[PDB]
């Protein structure tokens, strides 16, 4: 088989300036009939892959100039003349010269972008969720940066560290920031013997703690 | 416009069989061939197979040659792959795509869990804030995965984070956030809709000002 190398998993690059992906392959791509057969997509969390590229150097419709592809018949590079944040995701080549067709293993852009404090929102249980027994602490830390964040869960003031689960999501396609949910999940009994919640974040934008709290009683 | 549309989940028992389905729409579907690539989870794409549909003319990549079985049929515009005897290595996402001269289109692909653990539809509830604004929706307890979470039926879609599902006793949990201007609600209606596939349920659900 054509072996397709993208020997980067990753690159990083600071918004507004140019980057080059590279992509090998183990035989030339130039076909008998004058073309080089290589495609460049790009691929967004939870999306199908994005045509860039065909023909190893024609932009597709609707993508922007400042795409552009190039190669020999073994060596080829995508430029992205200026980084903007919607260019965040998974870039793959393909060749399609011989069967089986075969792809490199993709290349994430990282966006290195500027500090940037989160929005801190705490969201009591539903009261639909009461009536089934269980209750939900929700925390939500949007649009951060860098990635690394602690939070803490407080109850009437002590710390609570069993019961919760995080998840971040990938950079925003707009901003290139992070966020993340805090859930804390406990029986309705547990919820209803304590009265103050707390959820407690540290970022590198403070030297102090990004608090927000609720009391359950207080509607 | 050319499309191929493909079921979001299939959940497969260990060792069962599964066929896979794309429909096709807006061009002679005899005429151009269709490809399929799977995707590991957090992994790469790679390529499975291509089949012409006037013909039912067939490619395979070796390494699936006692996996993958490639059809058509031609009377309802629909390519066919079925997976045989499946592993926890063949739960991916599967995409059919198509080729039209140099320019593919793809479909949005679906998601093959291998297991014995029974569908199970989320819970979902809608968050309020404590007594801009942000405004939560929770989805609890599913599986498989996906879901597919909205607000408005998709028509709010700036200031939405929709965060990655967790897993714990077999059981999913996903939120989302919403974030709008103070003015918009609750003056204006904000609801948080959530289809599961895999149990064939929508279920929406208008955020409330929280009462005493």
């Known amino acids: 088989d054509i072996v397709m190398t993208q020997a980067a998993p990753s690159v990083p690059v600071t918004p507004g300036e140019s980057v080059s992906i590279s992509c090998r392959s183990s035989?030339?791509?130039?076909?008998?009939?004058?073309?080089?057969?290589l495609y460049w997509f790009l691929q967004r969390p939870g999306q199908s892959p994005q045509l860039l590229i065909y023909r190893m150097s024609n932009l597709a419709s609707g993508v922007p100039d400042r795409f552009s592809g190039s190669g020999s018949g073994t060596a080829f590079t995508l430029r992205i003349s200026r980084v903007e944040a919607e260019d965040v995701g998974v870039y793959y080549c393909l060749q399609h010269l011989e069967y089986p067709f075969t792809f490199g293993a993709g290349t994430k852009l990282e966006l290195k972008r500027a500090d940037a404090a989160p929005t801190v929102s705490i969201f009591p249980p539903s009261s639909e969720q009461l009536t089934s027994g269980g209750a939900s602490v929700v925390c939500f830390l949007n649009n951060f940066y860098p990635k690394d964040i602690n939070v803490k869960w407080k109850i009437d003031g002590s710390e609570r560290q069993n019961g919760v689960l995080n998840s971040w999501t990938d950079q925003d396609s707009k901003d290139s920031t992070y966020s993340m949910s805090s859930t804390l999940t406990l029986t309705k009994d547990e919820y209803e013997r304590h009265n103050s919640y707390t959820c407690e974040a540290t970022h590198k934008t403070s030297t102090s703690p990004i608090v927000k709290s609720f009391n359950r009683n207080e509607c | 416009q050319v499309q191929l549309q493909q079921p979001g989940a299939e959940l497969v028992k260990p060792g069962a069989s599964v066929k896979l389905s794309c429909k096709a729409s807006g061009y002679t579907f005899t005429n151009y061939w269709i490809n399929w690539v799977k995707q590991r989870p957090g992994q790469g794409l790679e390529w499975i197979g291509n089949?012409?549909?006037?013909?039912?003319?067939?490619h395979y990549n070796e390494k699936f040659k006692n996996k993958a079985t490639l059809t058509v049929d031609t009377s309802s515009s629909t390519a066919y792959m079925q997976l045989s005897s499946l592993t926890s290595d063949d739960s991916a996402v599967y995409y059919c795509?198509?080729?039209?001269?140099?320019?593919?289109?793809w479909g949005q692909g679906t998601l093959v869990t291998v297991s014995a653990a029974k569908t199970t539809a989320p819970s979902v509830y809608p968050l309020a804030p404590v007594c801009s604004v942000t405004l939560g929706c929770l989805v609890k307890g599913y599986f498989p995965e996906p879901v597919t979470l909205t607000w408005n039926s998709g028509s709010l879609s700036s200031g939405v984070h929709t965060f990655p599902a967790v897993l714990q006793s077999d059981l999913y949990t996903l939120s989302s956030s919403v974030t709008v201007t103070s003015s918009t609600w609750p003056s204006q209606s904000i609801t948080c809709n959530v289809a599961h596939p895999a149990s064939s349920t929508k279920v929406d659900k208008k955020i409330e000002p929280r009462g005493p």
């Open positions: 795509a198509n080729k039209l001269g140099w320019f593919p289109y």
């Open positions: 035989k030339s791509l130039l076909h008998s009939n004058g073309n080089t057969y």
């Open positions: 089949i012409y549909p006037g013909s039912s003319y067939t």
